Each structure stands twice: as structure tokens, then as C-alpha cells.
Design a protein around this ligand. Structure first.
Ligand SMILES: [Cu+2]
Ligand SMILES: [Cu+2]
Ligand SMILES: [Cu+2]
Ligand SMILES: [Cu+]
Ligand SMILES: [Cu+]
Ligand SMILES: [Cu+]
Lengths: 337, 336, 336
């Protein structure tokens, strides 16, 4: 497309919503290609990542860890206004894995505090894709400080299975998984720091062990539990988008399955089916489609169970509906032998 | 199906066999859907896992690590009687990844010592699937104490390749891989404990390092080597089911291949082919089909070779038959 | 094929080149099956792996880490002359993952210093495959001393996509990724040694942590940058072969994609498409095909970004050509 042709396209402004929710969109594209406009303000902010009060100086697209999910369709243009407020201390940029050129946009979006930039790219490939900050020389430090999210580029005709049958979800959640590396004192207690820069050296040391202290969804241990548990109903079709910008994960819905899983996150790559546990490598997003069949509580976890239940990588679903005794029944409840 | 239809299905009791062997079954289903009944007794016991007398307080389905492979067909029901003897000291349950609902059955099977339970579930999806204990608040501790196994839900018409041609194995083995986290004292000597609970705090500290002290097949270093090597013959077709309930592995048959590999373990997902090394994520089972072409000793490993050769994740096959010089020949033997 | 049939086949001697370059070859086979002849001399040598002067006692096929890429076509025979000079101190052998029997050739190629051997195997399966040294009882130590590489067995009709459409590359590069485990003294400084054997015990202690001190391409931090950055032009189709003999990796072309990726490395397994980041398990090779569409610098990384940017796993591409503003444009450059 020429400059004139792109200038002629309709523009659509989108208001982002905080994970694990996803901004309103249509699965099947409405009309021809558009320039879809998003704005994110970067916030360097203290966040608490566990019940003990452990603090991280987070670097947060739109003030959240993960950053929000942007949804467009294949061959739309994504136009991001990225703002680095003067209250911040560090330069920041953005690498969209969905994009082609200039280090995914990183080379064109280096903004100092008090600066903004507008990047446009053509979303040429359908799938879910990581985005993350990547300032030359400080790349992993920004990413493991929470400065990452994902986007979804839906096919113009919506999702299909590996054989051309339409797959239409009733709801979608975005689970951003974050490995944190929090320095400890000689008592083995987590350190707090006055400024983000104060924590750098101590944090790099932990990072180099390749052993996160916390592995969490939505920025904190237990973040997607209790009144923040995800929800569904028997018969409801749910898409769970999952990202990890730095480190491998292996999602599992305890009590369920991934009926269709785009484990590579790419929609032209046929999904795996009937999955127990799927695998998303560090630096990628994946998506699983499931129709709930049983009511009750589910745990959705990274199935390294140490990572899930010791380090924080467990969320819950609460599911309404009628129990199905055909699928499963307690023939004899726990009782004396 | 209607209530009367489910009630009318035949019930069949099956006797289990210890890993790496697999109980009697048919690849193609015999007759219609059945309720296949299994019984497993949970044993808490000290086991030695290496050549240095290192102990683990194992938590073992049916007394083995891994627990035994249960084999059914798609749309059968698996009806398990799970027994926790009064001599045990912990509550146990079971999560079948093959099952749908109540945390895979975990929510319905919490049994204290001196209790039993019977769970039935419909095996709606074909594949190999992990099962493991999962008491709320103590999940990884039970799993890394060896309380995990796998089942296989065969398609009613047996296995096929991606092009729908039948794949019929001559034999099947189940390799369960276990990451252990054994505490050490300040001299680097592995610690021993009187009761399982006594090891809890020290063990969790090791677990949180994400670095196992041992990675083993069939519950111990070298358990599937020497006189306990798996066997085959040139021309024989072998299915190797592999599981890891907590941690990634990357199986490899040294000297061979995975001709067809359901790396995700699910039979409705077409198998990868001609594989050198396949990948099974923690919390899953996979299966590899191979036709042996050469006699001799093979190593079957987790191909992180430190895990295989320093930490214990190496098995052998001993294969009989005629050498094939077309496939491989020493043109010049090692010489000056 | 019979012995006589093989003896009648054409022979072709190949001259190997140092990674990341690949020796001259044809994508589509030229004529029928041949016996393709390669020679490699093993060199035990010191390598410097970072800008702090950190040393490894490398054990290097053809003097490089990784060893060179050998390219044949399916159903060719690969005939390797392997030479262990008297100047070396250790026994070495070779396991080709592409080969069938005798532990991939390891059981037939054990050569002491001052010995050579010649191994022939039939390349029956198309794909990229790891090869590595594997002396019994010292297997991972040789592998993580850099004694590994890969081969490519092309289909005789060259590469195709999942739908049978031809994929023809303009350039090919081979990135061998290496995990190193370098001992440190009490002050956290990397130790140096004056013989490979002197480092064994200390190195094993680090290996057993499963935590590499360095993760590098082509034997050193920054090896494939600057004077050794890989190159292309807009429009050019490039195949990137990537291996890791011991440990998982997750390649990603920063600024680009893997248009087609044989993540398992096997050409009869249809490639994944439009990949952001692919995954290659330890003990395997994979291959990604991409057509460059933008000029400029790309980083090619293991996308554990700590591994890439703290531990060394980052390469660059330098790409010539015209910028495409349709694909990407700065609507407003960084400004107040
Ligand atoms: Cu990235
Ligand atoms: Cu599980
Ligand atoms: Cu190998
Ligand atoms: Cu940043
Ligand atoms: Cu248990
Ligand atoms: Cu060697």
C-alpha cells in the first residue's frame, strides 16, 4: 500500500482495559483494513507482588503488569502513541514481536522522560505476540521489571480450527506471566529500595542465577484469585491468551484441558488438540480455546508445580452450572476402609 | 448416553503391573465402551535412589515410582478404587489429567489414612496423560516425592500415523521420570529423616531452587540399566510412553529415533516424525513409536546430558538381531 | 543396498568451512545417491569466551565451536574420517543423531590420540541433526566443552512448505549455541587451567548446578557480531540452522520472524509458520526460513533475555536495502 492509500484508511481509536480483561473487539473483521490507534503511558511505580508486601520497582506499560492486550485484525495497521512522562527516570521503547523492522519498533521508539513517539506498523501475520521494552544495554532488566505485554492479531475471518471450522469464543482472558528476581538480605528476606536504580546491581545478580524468586500472573501472587478469579459457565467457550516475554511456561487448566491450543501462538499454524499441558517458550504468547463442561473451581497454572504453588503461578476460575456425573462421579466418597 | 445406558455398560477389573511394564490390553478396542476398574494402594516408604544410599520418603501409588500405567480406550470409563492404609501418615488424593471436573478428581478423592474412595470418569480424549496426587496446599511436595504416574487412552481403532495408516506396536514401555530434591547438610551430605513430615521444610527449600539433586527413571539412578535394561529385537515396533509430572524433559533414543512422536501426548494431534529428540513439558506425558533396525545397546536419555549422566536420567535398551551394514558400517576401525 | 551396490556409487569429497558459513552444496540433489566424504581433525585447544579473558578448554571438531555443518541429501551415505592427533590428551568419538546403530556411531568411533577412524552411515531421514562427542563415562563434559555440531540432510528435491510448495534459500547460516560451566574462585573470578583434565572436577561441580555461566553462539560472547555479523539484503531468503546439544533454547529474530520453522528440525514434519520465537530442546537442531523485508540491524537471540544479554546468547544480522514504510513507519519521532 502507498502512503496515499494508508492515509485514506479509516481510523479507529481504542480505549485499553486492564488485564486479564480485553478491550471490546469483533472476532470477524468489520469492513476493510483500518488504522487502529492505541495510547499507552509508561509508569515507573512501586508494586507489591505477594502477601508479605514484597516490593518491585515495576516498569509498566499503561500502569499494569502485564501491559494491556491490544487487539487488531490481520492487515490492519497498529498505531501506538507511547508516552514516557517526565516523572520517570529511564529511557524506554517498545519491541512488537508482531511487527517487521527496526528491532520490532524498538529502534524507532527510544523515548526519554518527557518525550512521546508514534509508531505505526502493518499487522501482517495473525496470532498472539509478545511486546516488551528493550533499551540497548538494559534489555532483560526492563522486561523482568514487568515491562511487557502482548497483542492479538485476529484473522479477518476470525478463528478457525486446523480444518477450517469456525471457532468462536464467548469470552477472552489475557494471562501475562512474569518472572521476578527479587534480591534478599542475609536473613533471606526480600530487600526494599528507595529508587529503581538502587536495585539494579543486586537484581542482575539474582537474574544471572536464572532462578526467579516469584513467578506470577497479572503482576502478583494470587492476583487472579478470590474476587479477582476468572469466571465461566458450563458450555461457555473461553480463549485464554498467555504470554511470557523472558522465560518458558507450561500452562495447564487443572480439571480441564486445552481443546484447541495455538501453542506457538500463531493462527496459521494449526492448533494442537485435547491438550493436558501446553508449552510457551520465553519470548512468546500462546492461546488455548476451551469449552467448560463441569462447574466449580479450577486452578490455571504453570505446571512446574513448584513454580505454580511455591513461586506464585496459579490463578483460579469459578464456573457456574450443573455437575455432569457422566463425565465424572464419586462412586464412593472418602470413607473408612 | 442415558442413565440406563451407562448403568448397563460392562464392568471389567484389570490387574496392574509395575513400571516400566504395562498390563494386558488390546490396541484396537474389544467390544463397546466399558467401565474399566482399577485398584491402587498408596504406600509411604523410604526408598534408596542412588549408589550412595541416598533416601527419599516416597509417596507411591501402588507402591511404585512412577505409579503404574492404566490403559483404557476412548469413551471407556476409568473407575479407580484408591486406598490409603491406616499405617500411612498423610492425606492423599488423585488428579487425572485425562479427566474433566473437580480438579481432575482431586476434589473428590481426598482420603486420610484408613480411608478409601472410588472415582469414575469418562475418558473422552485419546492420548497419554499424567496423573498425580494434589492435596491442596501441598501439591508439589507430594508430586516430587514420586506420587505421579500416567494413563493411556487409546483410540478405539488403535494408533494411526498422520496419513491414517495403522501403527501397531509389538511392545510398550512406560518410563516415568522423577525430579527429586534431597536436602543436604552443610558438608554436602544428603540428609535422612525419621518421618516424611520431618523433611518438609528442608525439602521445600531445595524445591524453590528449581534445581533437582536427582533426575531419574523408574524411581532410581540406573533403575532401567544393566539387568533391568528394556529389550527389543531388530524389526520390532516399540512404543515408549514417557511422563514428567512437574518438570520439562527431552527424551532421546541414542542410536535410534522417534519414528512417530506424539510429543504433546495427544493422539488427535498428528505425530511429529523422524525425531532425534522430542520435548515433553512438565505436567505432561508423550509417546514415541520406533521400529528397531540395529542390534546392540541403546541409551535412552533426557538429553540434557548433565541430567542424564550426572543426575541419573539414563536408561538402556538391549536389542537382539542382525547388524545392518547398509545403515552403518565401520569402514576403518579405530587405529594408528 | 548391498555392499556391491554401495561400492558402485559415486563418491564426492567435501571441504568443510567454519561456522556460521556452510560448505558449497546444492539444495536439490545433483544426481542419484552418493557416498559423501568428510574429514575432521579434533583439536583440544584453549578458547576465550568473553571480554574478561575467560578461558575454556574446548574440545573442537575441525578446530571450531560448534563443529562445522555437514550437508548431504536423504539416502546419501555420509562417510566421516575422524582424526584424533597425538597432540591431544583424551579419547574422543562421535554420535550422529542422523545415524542408526551403535549409539549414533559412538560405539564404533572411539579413537585415542594418534588414532583415526572411518565411519559410514546412510542418511535415511531428512532434517537438521545434532552430532556430538560421547565417550562413555565422560559424555556431558565433552559436549559442554564445545564438542558438538550439526548436519543437514536435505530432501533430494530440496525444501518445501507444508503444502508442497518449494522453499529455496539464497543464504544459509549455522548458529551453534553452547552452554559453558566455568569454575570461579572465592572472589568470583573465573579460574584458568593449563590442561583439560585439571578443570574436570571443578567443571563438574558447576555443571551439576544446571546453571551455565555463559550461553554463547559460535563459541564466544559477541562472536556473531561486528566483523562476524551475519548479512542479508531485503528480498533475500535465509535459512538459519540452530543447534543445542545439551540444553534448551528459544531462538528469535528481533525485528523479523521465522516465516517457516522446522522447530523439531525434521523436514518430514510440516513447518510451523509466522513464528515470533521457536523452541529447540537440548539435544536437537532446528531450522528457520525467513525472507528479509526491512534493512538494518537485527538481533538474533535465545529469547530468555537474561541468557541473551547477560550470558552471551545474541548475534546480529546486518541487512542492506530499501526501508518499507508500509510495514513500519515512525509517525512521530521521539520528541518533547
Ligand atoms: Cu522480544
Ligand atoms: Cu497436574
Ligand atoms: Cu546426543
Ligand atoms: Cu522500559
Ligand atoms: Cu499424596
Ligand atoms: Cu570428545
Amino acid at each position: 500500500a502507498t502512503a496515499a492509500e494508508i492515509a485514506a484508511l479509516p481510523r479507529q481509536k481504542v480505549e485499553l482495559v486492564d488485564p486479564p480483561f480485553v478491550h471490546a473487539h469483533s472476532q470477524v473483521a468489520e469492513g476493510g483494513p483500518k488504522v487502529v490507534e492505541f495510547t499507552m503511558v509508561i509508569e515507573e511505580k512501586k508494586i507489591v507482588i505477594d502477601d508479605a508486601g514484597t516490593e518491585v520497582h515495576a516498569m509498566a506499560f499503561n500502569g499494569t503488569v502485564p501491559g494491556p492486550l491490544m487487539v487488531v485484525h490481520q492487515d490492519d495497521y497498529l498505531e501506538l502513541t507511547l508516552i514516557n512522562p517526565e516523572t520517570n527516570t529511564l529511557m524506554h521503547n517498545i519491541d512488537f514481536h508482531a511487527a517487521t523492522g527496526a528491532l520490532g519498533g524498538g529502534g524507532l521508539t527510544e523515548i526519554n522522560p518527557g518525550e512521546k513517539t508514534i509508531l505505526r506498523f502493518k499487522a501482517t501475520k495473525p496470532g498472539v505476540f509478545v511486546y516488551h521494552c528493550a533499551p540497548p544495554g538494559m534489555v532483560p532488566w526492563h522486561v523482568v521489571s514487568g515491562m511487557n505485554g502482548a497483542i492479538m492479531v485476529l484473522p479477518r475471518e476470525g478463528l478457525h480450527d486446523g480444518k477450517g471450522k469456525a471457532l468462536t469464543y464467548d469470552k477472552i482472558y489475557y494471562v501475562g506471566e512474569q518472572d521476578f528476581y527479587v534480591p534478599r538480605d542475609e536473613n533471606g528476606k526480600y530487600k526494599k529500595y528507595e529508587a529503581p536504580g538502587d536495585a539494579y546491581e543486586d537484581t542482575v545478580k539474582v537474574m544471572r542465577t536464572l532462578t526467579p524468586t516469584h513467578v506470577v500472573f497479572n503482576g502478583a501472587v494470587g492476583a487472579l484469585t478470590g474476587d479477582k478469579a476468572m469466571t465461566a459457565a458450563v458450555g461457555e467457550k473461553v480463549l485464554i491468551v498467555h504470554s511470557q516475554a523472558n522465560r518458558d511456561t507450561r500452562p495447564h487448566l487443572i480439571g480441564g484441558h486445552g481443546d484447541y491450543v495455538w501453542a506457538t501462538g500463531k493462527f496459521n499454524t494449526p492448533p494442537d488438540v485435547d491438550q493436558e499441558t501446553w508449552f510457551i517458550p520465553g519470548g512468546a504468547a500462546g492461546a488455548a480455546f476451551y469449552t467448560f463442561q463441569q462447574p466449580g473451581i479450577y486452578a490455571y497454572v504453570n505446571h512446574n508445580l513448584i513454580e505454580a504453588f511455591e513461586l506464585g503461578a496459579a490463578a483460579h476460575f469459578k464456573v457456574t452450572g450443573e455437575w455432569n456425573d457422566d463425565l465424572m462421579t464419586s462412586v464412593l466418597a472418602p470413607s473408612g476402609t
